[PDB]
Amino acid sequence: MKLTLWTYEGPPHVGAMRVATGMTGMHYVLHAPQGDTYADLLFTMIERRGKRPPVSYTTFQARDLGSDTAELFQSACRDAYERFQPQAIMVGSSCTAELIQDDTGGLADALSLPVPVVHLELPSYQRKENFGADESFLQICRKLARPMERTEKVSCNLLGPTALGFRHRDDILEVTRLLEGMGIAVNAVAPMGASPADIARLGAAHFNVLLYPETGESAARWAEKTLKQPYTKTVPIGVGATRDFVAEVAALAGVAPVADDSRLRQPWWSASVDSTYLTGKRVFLFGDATHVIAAARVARDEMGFEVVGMGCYNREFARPMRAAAKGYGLEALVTDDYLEVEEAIQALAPELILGTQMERHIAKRLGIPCAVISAPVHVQDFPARYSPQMGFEGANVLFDTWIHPLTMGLEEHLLTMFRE
C-alpha cells in the first residue's frame, strides 16, 4: 500500500522467467492477463536477446472468467507443446492468477502431457523476483535432477548464473577459465546454459560452486542432502576473494591451487603513485548482497577507500549484510525505497557512491561521482565487450570502472579552476 515510484526488483515470475529463458528446452506458461505480456520486452531488448523468450501467455480478459480461463490455459499449454516442442515444461502463475480460482497444477495434471511438468507456487505478493528464480531452480532440480554415478574426473556445477544477471555471461566465462586453470571440468552451467539433460547430469558433479547465492543457494542446499553435493561458500569477486575461492575449490576437489597471477594488474595500479589520492575517500555501497559485500571488502582492503555507507535491497540476505556492516562498523540500510537511500547519501555525503541505476541517477542529481555495481541497470550497462565482475580480470575491471567517475570529476574540477 506504500507508494513506490521506483522498485529495485520485479515480481517473482520475472525471476522465474529469467531462469526459464536462461536454459534451453524449457517453455514457461504464464496464467497472466493480457497486457502483462510486456515482460519479454526487457529480455528481448535490455539483454539484447536474438530469440523470443521461451514463454507463452494465456492473456485472459474480462470476458474470459471462470471456466474460460481454464480452457484458455489448457489450449495455451497444448499449442505451446505442439508448436514450440519443449523438452521440459513448467506451469506458472501471475499476480492476478492466484486471486482467481484457477489451479495451475490441476490444469497441468489434466493436460497429462508426456513431457514432465512442475507446478510453480509463486507468492507474488509476499516475495520478489530473485526468490522466484531460486524457487524455480530448486523445483526443476527436484523434478529432473536425480542422484547418479560420479564422473571419472572431478567435476563441478556453477549454480546461480541466470538471465538478466549482472555480467553473468562474463562471470561464467571467467570462472570457467579459472577452473580449467586448475583443470577441473565444469559438468553443467546452470541456469545460464542449462538443459533438461544438463539438469539430469547436474548430480554428476563432485561438488557445486555457488557463483551467485540469490539464485542458486537453495539449489545447492538441496543438492547437499539429495545428491550429497558440497557447495563452495566464498564468492570470488576481488583479488583476496579470488584467492579464498581458489583455496576453497582446491580443497574440495583436492587438486593443487595452481593460481595464475599473470594477467592481474589491479594491485600494482592501486599501489601506483598516481593512485595516492584515492586513500581516505568515503564510499557508499548499495545493491545486491554478495556484490555489496565484495565491493566493501575490495574498497576497504585493496582500494584505500573508507566504506561510509552500506546497504542491500536483497532482504533475504540482510543477515550477511548486517554482519559485514558490523565488520566495517557501519549501519546496514536494508530499505527497498529510493528515498531512504537518497536521504542516507544526503546525510553521509560520500565522495563516491557505487550502487545501481537509482544510485547513479541520484548521484547525478547530487553532483557526486557514481558507478553501477549491482543488478538493476539500463541497456547500456550490459556491454558487448566482455566485462567480468569476478576473478583476476574482474579485479582490473572493477578498479578502472570505479576510477572513471573519480578521474572524470577531478579533471572537470581542474578545468573549472583553470579557466577561472
Binding site: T7, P33, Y38, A39, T59, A62, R83, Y125, H361
Partner: protein, 401 residues
Amino acid sequence: LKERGQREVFCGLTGIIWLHRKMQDAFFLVVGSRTCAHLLQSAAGVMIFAEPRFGTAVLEEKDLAGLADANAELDREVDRLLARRPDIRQLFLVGSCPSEVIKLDLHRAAERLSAHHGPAVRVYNFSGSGIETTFTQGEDACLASIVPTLPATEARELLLVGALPDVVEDQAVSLLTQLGIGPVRCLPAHHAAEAPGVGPNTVFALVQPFLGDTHGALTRRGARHIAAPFPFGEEGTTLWLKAIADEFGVSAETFEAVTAAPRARARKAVAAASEGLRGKSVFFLPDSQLEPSLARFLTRECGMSAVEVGTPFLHRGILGPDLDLLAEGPVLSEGQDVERQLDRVRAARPDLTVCGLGLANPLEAEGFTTKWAIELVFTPVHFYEQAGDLAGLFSRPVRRR
C-alpha cells in the same frame, strides 16, 4: 482473424507514461501489484529518475485480502501525496488487473475523495487495465472520464481532442487560425489551465485515431464527429483541414490558397524520404490502433505496398474515411493471435515490419527489418511539420549487411 490463442500487447497503464506529459497538473495513483509497477517503471525508463506523476502503490497481501482497507488506504495515500505535491490538483485512480479481479469500486472512492478534498483539488478515475482495455484505450478512457466534469458550453467552437505534443498543438492552433474561422478549445488542456467547456454546440473533429471512448463521451454531451481523414502525412493533414473548413463553411479557394506554403514544405520533406521506401512490402501488427492511418499514408504518399494491417480493435464508424482513402490491397484484421500473424509474416517476407518492441528483435534476427510502434506515439509525426519525419521514421536505410 480474431483468434485469442496468444496476445502480445501492453496494459493501458502504458498510456499514463506520455499522458501525464500533456497535463502537468495530473497525478496518477495506480492501484496495481508489483507487476504493473514494474511495467510502468521499465517502459518509462529514464522518467522514474526525474520524479514523474506516476504513483503505483503495490497491493500487498494486507490490503488485497480485504476491500475497505484499501479504500481507506487510498484516502490516506492521496492526502499524503497531495502534501508532497501542493501544485498537483487533478488526480486519476487508474484501474489495474488486481483491482479488477478484487472488484475494487474506484468510482465511489474517487467521488467521495473529491467530495472531501474539495473544489480546489479534483479526482476523477478510470480503468486502464489489460483485463478490459489495452494500450491506447487508457487515454480515451481517461479523457472520457474527465468529459462529464467539463461544463456544457453554448458557443459553437472548433474542438480538438487528443493527447498531442505541445508544439504540434501550437502549430495546429496556428494553422486553424490561419484558416480564420473556428475557435479552438484543447480538451487535454495544458495542466488544466483552461477548463474546456464542452456541450452540444461544439462540433468536434478527431486527430488521434485510437480515441474510441472519446466519441461516446462527446455524444453524451451531444457533439458530433465529422468524417475527416486523420492528419498523417501532408495529404492526410490537408484533407483533415479541408474537412474542418467544410464543417465551418470555409471557402475552398480560401483554404486552398492559405495553406499552400506549409504543404509545399511538407511535400518537400515527405519526398526527401519517399524514395527510400519505394516498391517494398510491409506488415502491420496490433500495437496502438494507429496502424490503418499509417498504412494509408505509406501506401498513397510514400509509395508503400501494404501486405497486411493488424489492429486490435477497429472503430469503423470513425475510421471509415481512413479506410476509403486506404486501398483495397492490405487485409484489415481485428486482433490476430501473435503466432498466426507471425506465420503470415514469415510467409509474406515483409521488408519492413511494424510491431511491438518485444517482437522486434526476434524478427530482426530472423532477417526482417523492424520498426516498433511504441516509438511513434512519443515522437511527433502528426502534422505538416512532421509529415517528412513520419516517413523518415520508417526510412531505416541501414543496409549494413
